[PDB]
Amino acid sequence: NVLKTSTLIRLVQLVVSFVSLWLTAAGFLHLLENSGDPFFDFGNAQHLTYWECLYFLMVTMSTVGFGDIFATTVLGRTFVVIFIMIFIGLFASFIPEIAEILGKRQKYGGSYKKERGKRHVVVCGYITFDSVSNFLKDFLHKDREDVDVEIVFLHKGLPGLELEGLLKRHFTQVEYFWGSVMDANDLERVKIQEADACLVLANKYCQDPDQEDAANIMRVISIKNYHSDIKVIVQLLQYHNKAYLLNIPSWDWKRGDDAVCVAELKLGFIAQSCLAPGFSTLMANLFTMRSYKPTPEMSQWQTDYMRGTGMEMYTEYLSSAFNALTFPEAAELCFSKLKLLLLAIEVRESTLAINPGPKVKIENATQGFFIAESAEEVKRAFYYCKNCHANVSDVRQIKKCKC
Amino acid sequence: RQWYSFLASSLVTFGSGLVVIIIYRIVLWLCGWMTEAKDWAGELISGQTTTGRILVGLVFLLSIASLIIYFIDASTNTSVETCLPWSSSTTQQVDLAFNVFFMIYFFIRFVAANDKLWFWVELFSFVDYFTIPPSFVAIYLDRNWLGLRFLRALQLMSIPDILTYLNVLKTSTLIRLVQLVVSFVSLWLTAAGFLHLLENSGDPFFDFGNAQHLTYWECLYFLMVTMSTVGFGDIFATTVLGRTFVVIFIMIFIGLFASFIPEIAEILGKRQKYGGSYKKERGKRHVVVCGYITFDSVSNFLKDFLHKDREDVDVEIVFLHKGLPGLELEGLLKRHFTQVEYFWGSVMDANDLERVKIQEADACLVLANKYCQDPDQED
């Protein structure tokens, strides 16, 4: 049972038959030439080694034919003519076979290998050049706040040319595997236990979204069943399909699993834009990486706009200097003293509150939500001291041992 | 027979480091300052550091320089071990300098090795075990075995990545091509050195008395004459080792090539038959056509627009459409080819509007399917 699949069987059959033909034919020619032949009363022999005859049949079977070891018995010559034809005939019958058993190989087989401290996240579902691009252009954006993780796709069937071009264009970061998250063996090839999350993607233009959402749910069931505590993020098409995720035993959004719903957000942005014109873009930029790269030939309005597109959301724990302030005071200090815009806070029992009323106090070690240039720019809110640093003018030194 | 002194140095280098790695692992099985250098070496090898990238480019260029020293040595003629005293001699010690540079680089990787086992049984580690140790034997013994020094040529396999770093090649087709062509010359150059060594040596069964004094250039030619299956029989081999290497070379070339026939067919087949741009011949005017371009829709227009008289005025007629014309339209196009041009493309793309010089065409005509199954969509 050393060989298993039909391809290896055939191969071994073909290769065995080939060496069997070659070894035997060499003995036959060796006999004739070392004998001479009866027409010349065995006087016309060539004293060839069997090794020369084995070599000579390779040199002729390959159609190279150096003409170093030519035959001279009439029986040798006539055997060589038959050998040429019967080899061409046998080989021509096997050309198709060879082409098939060569062609059956998967171009995207194998397993992912975990390079110790290098992290990665898995992607599966509706993987297509467009659906990949709009994700990948953010996930592999030219800055990420200086963090790198590998991105590993698995899908069944081939990527198609445009996606293969995109894959090759990023090949140090990205990997693709033939397979499906419906199979525990593929969840093992892709080391799901050692990936830190899995992202599941869907066809926004599916001709029946109930079926696409049913298919994407199935997966989350497969992934959660294989290893309970994995982080999962799933793209649903319709709103009401979210109900089914809450039924899965090891689904927990407080723990940190999540579902993004296309119909919920797509119309929700449009709706807020009816209440406040243009707001859709304020939102769409504030939650996606953009490159602030001002140049002198830009218009004045384009430069101010871009700097505005450079803004990002971050979150941080506030300094003890914020203890028992009211929210408007914390916001005034963040804006005026730190040059940070503070939107919202985590408050205990967990809940999120945006622009809280003056009736609240900011409690110790609450997490705040900031709009800023970079995560580094926000760290001042964690460090700032009402005794030690409130006197400081230039904010680029607020991190210190005094507290 | 001085040559055994050289190849022994390669063998003991490989075997002693192998045994040390085996001891390490089995001892740790049967029972931190490194970690900075580990990752720092990994960066320099990645070439995401500009230094690491530069040094990789230099490692590659210096590998090409090493082969020139080998071809000059092969240009010296005479037997496979032949020498004169090294004292201020010729140019020799430049490849000692290159060998220690490569051994230093080999230590870097050893540091970055991950699994020492698979690092020690690596193709380029074999290249290093063969070339590095005999270089010292040569200057020490005051003698020169030509040896396996041509193996360094496998570093030509760097070219696809170097041209990716410099971004000289872009599309997947050019990538592949360059990979295939590089692998082909790497195989050809190296195989020639291997055969050259055998035949100029003779072989042990005939106590090295049966040699052929082939140049490396003859061996490089001879492998082309056999790889092409032409086989003139002018430069036939005669060592048993040469003959048996030639038999293996024939089979392994046929096997490699047969695996790549499909690939070659695909990367050949992907070319657009109707690519390119229209070039404006100054005072010659033209008008653009696009939309439902089909043999019939073309014909009934074209038979008026290119009618045998027009009141004596001539302008070129330039179609663009996505996908191929089909045979009957291609026949009509060839039948008028001095007047008419066809381009793969669409007026939905500003780059195609530029290839077709829309700013310098004097009009554009847009054509539609009269028999569309839903005219609202066609309109």
Residue numbers in the entry:
A (entry chain B): 214 to 561, 567 to 621
B (entry chain A): 14 to 44, 79 to 426
Describing publication, verbatim:
The large-conductance calcium- and voltage-activated K+ channel (BK) plays a fundamental role in establishing negative feedback loops to control the firing patterns of neurons, transmitter release, insulin secretion, and smooth muscle contraction. Additionally, two homologous regulators of the conductance of K+ domains (RCK) in each subunit (RCK1 and RCK2) assemble as a tetrameric gating ring (4× CTD) and serve as the cytoplasmic Ca2+ sensor.
Neutralizing arginine at position R3 (R202Q) drives the VSD towards its resting state, as suggested by the rightward shift of Q-V in the homologous mutant in hBK36. Remarkably, the VSD structure of apo R3Q is like apo WT but results in a considerably narrower pore (radius ~4.2 Å, HOLE) compared to the WT apo structure (radius ~5.7 Å, HOLE). We suggest that R3Q stabilizes a deep closed state of the BK pore and that conformation is evidence of an activation-deactivation gating mechanism based on reorienting the S6-based inner bundle helix. However, the tight closure at I308 was sufficient to occlude entry of bbTBA in R3Q apo. This observation suggests that previous BK apo structures are consistent with a partially closed state, and only when the VSD is in its deeper resting state (R3Q apo) does the channel finally adopt a fully closed conformation. In the R3Q-apo, the αB helix is partially unfolded at its ends (residues: L374-K381), unlike in the R3Q Ca2+-bound state where the αB helix (residues: L372-R382) is reminiscent of all our open structures. The CTD at 0 Ca2+ exhibits a weak interaction with segment S5–S6 at PGD in the R3Q-apo structure.
